[model samples]
Structures are given as C-alpha cells and as structure tokens.
Target: GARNSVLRGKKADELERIRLRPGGKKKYRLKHIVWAANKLDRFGLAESLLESKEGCQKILTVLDPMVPTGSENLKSLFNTVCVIWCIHAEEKVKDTEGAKQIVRRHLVAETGTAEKMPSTSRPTAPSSEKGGNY
Candidate 1:
C-alpha cells in the first residue's frame, strides 16, 4: 500500500526516533494515510474514513495530544484537513457566500469568542448568475 511505501522511504534514524514510544507506530500510520490521501487527491476516501467511527477515534487520538503538545507534522496535517473540510463543505452547500458566512460563524464559537471577519476579506457574490451553471 501507499502507507507502506511511505514507511519504507523514511530514514532509519527518523523511524528509530518515533519507534521509541509504544504508540508511535500508530501515529506514523495515520501520518502516512494523510500524506497519501493528499498526494493522490483522495479526498473521497479520506472523508469517508474520517466519518467512520474507527477513523474518527484515530483522528482524535492524533489530535488530542498534538493540540497542546504542538507536533509540527500533526499541526500541518490539521491544516490540511481543515482546508479539505472547508472546500467540501462549500461545495456541498453550493453557495460560496453562504459557506464563508457559515464557517465564520462556527470559527467564532470554536475560538470561544466573536471574531470579526474583515470587510475586505469577504468575497463578492456571483453577480452574473443567480443559479446558472457558468
């Protein structure tokens, strides 16, 4: 599998560094999954797994500690996931303006305060088409 290839390509020193921990192997597995998914543009598979019970558990396992501990690789993975999640969400809603507003609303709640969206940052709505495909 792609994950196996990713593991095989890693340097021995790097592998040894992570192998010192009991659960480091699992961490590497998740890391490879994210890497492969991104490289292959396999967002459908990634999203499916993410929505699964076991997959959700694995994501939390990686993120729970990575949040406070600040694992740089995991933080990069978090950003990757966020970008994909937001893109898919916007596509699902079929309204770019609405999607941005929705994400902004949730961001405020997630950060525990009302964070304002800059007026200049707000994207203009499509003026040429009301709902037509262009």
Candidate 2:
C-alpha cells in the first residue's frame, strides 16, 4: 500500500478527533488538556493510580480556584479533572467540603489580626455617666 508519498518524524496528532467546543476558547482548552496529558505521561503517572480518589484529590490541590478571573483555564481544568474525579469520585455526595479544604488552603489564609485597632470609648470613667444623664 506504499502508493502515496510519505514523510516520517511525524506522529502523535489527535487534536482533531479531540475537538468539541470548536473555538479559540475551545482551542485553548484542548491545548491545556494535552499539556497535562503530556505532563502526566512524562511523570509516568501510570494513569491508573492517578485515577483513584486520593490521587485525584492530590491533583485537586493543583486545580480549583480559591480566587477569580480567567478561569477559562482552571475552569476547563476542573472540567477535565472532575470528569475523572467524578467518575471515580462517584457518589456525587458530600463533595464540596472535602475539596473545599485543599482548594481554599491558601485562600485568603487569614489568621490573627496581629495588627491594631482603635476600639475604645469615652465610657472610660464616671464622666461617661454624666453625658448619658444629660
């Protein structure tokens, strides 16, 4: 079947079949997935272990927005992630709280207000009583 001209050094191209949303936003999304696919591939993630609850949970730390703006990436990221996550995540019950922990771990991260405050009142003595009587 060697009838047509052939060129090698070219393989691995499935972005076409992966098509869906079909636009710049959609195009950008495809790019994101492939990048992560390659990342997990290079890491030899086994794609098996990474499909488990704990594994996806670990991956969750990397996705989900504890903030806002341009989520086109993270939003799409979660879509792909949670797709696998939801498949194994299952139940579809008691979800948010679990993920809530990691996603908002660094979110605002407010603790003690170690700063200072002007929380005082003229009621600081008997003079305050006279003012009230008046």
Candidate 3:
C-alpha cells in the first residue's frame, strides 16, 4: 500500500543518499519513487507510477537525450552508477544500450575510480569501558 499510495514519503532523502553511495541499492524510499514518478510525468511517459516492477525497467530511455540539458549528468564512473540508480528508482527507460553507451564512454574518458573516504573519516579506538557501551 505504501509503495502504491504513500510511496514517496522518504524518496528524496533516499535518492540524495543514493547519490552519495558508491553503487547504491534498488529498494529506494517513497519520496524518490515519487520524484522519479513526477520526473517521468513531466517528461511525458504514457504510464503511471503504479506500474509493475518489470515496468520500471524502462527508466533511462529518456535520459540519453535529456541529460545534455543538465539532468544530474555525473562524471563517467558516476554516470554508469547513476543509470543504475535511475533503474533502481523505477524510472522508465526505453533504449538501454544507448544510455549505457553514453555513460560508458564517459567512464573510459576518465580514470578516477580510486576514490577515497570522505574527509570526515577517521580511525576510531575501542572504548576502555565494560563491553564498549559508549
């Protein structure tokens, strides 16, 4: 019911987190589901957000042409990952190869996958307490 009626509750924040993740997961929140749904609606898809799981496989079909207009066109590595995110978010894509090729070219053009952890990362020591409740 949630995925059908109130599916987008946590969708945006989830997608925001997905954008931050390395590979990202498929089970996105409702807010992102709604956002992607709205995005599809705005782009002119002939279906509703209540489509079947298989229906979601059509996500990036619109991305190939729309991306040049500045639709979160991430760098090479992230581009491929972004496509995956789009599908995971249940967006509709028709031309899979074209879309994958676009991002693949970018991935080849660049060479920076050896990313590092965020600046906030640091090694932590075990607490000197009883079973480390701190």
TM-score to true structure, per model: 0.30, 0.33, 0.33
Q: Which residue window of length 10 is worst by lDDT in model 3?
A: 73-82
Task: State the lDDT of candidate 3 residue by residue for 1-134, as single tens digits.
Answer: 43533224443443334342334444334444455555555656533533443343344334444557554622332244344444444553333333455444544555355454457867898877556565
lDDT of 2 by residue, 16-115 (tens): 2222342323322335545555555564443443436567656655554422543464455454444344334332312333334433443335323433
Q: In model 2, what lDDT does residue 99 have? A: 34
| Runs off by more than 4 Å, candidate 3 | 1-20, 23-27, 46-50, 73-134
Clashes of each: 0, 0, 14
Candidate 1, pairs of clashing residues: none
lDDT of 3 at 65: 44
Candidate 1, residue 4: lDDT: 41
lDDT score of model 3? Answer: 0.43
Model 1 RMSD in Å is 16.9
Worst 10 residues of 1 by lDDT: 12-21
Q: Residue 131 in model 1: shift from native, Å?
A: 73
Give the clash count for model 3.
14
Considering summed lDDT, which 10 consecutive residues are worst modelled in model 2? Answer: 4-13
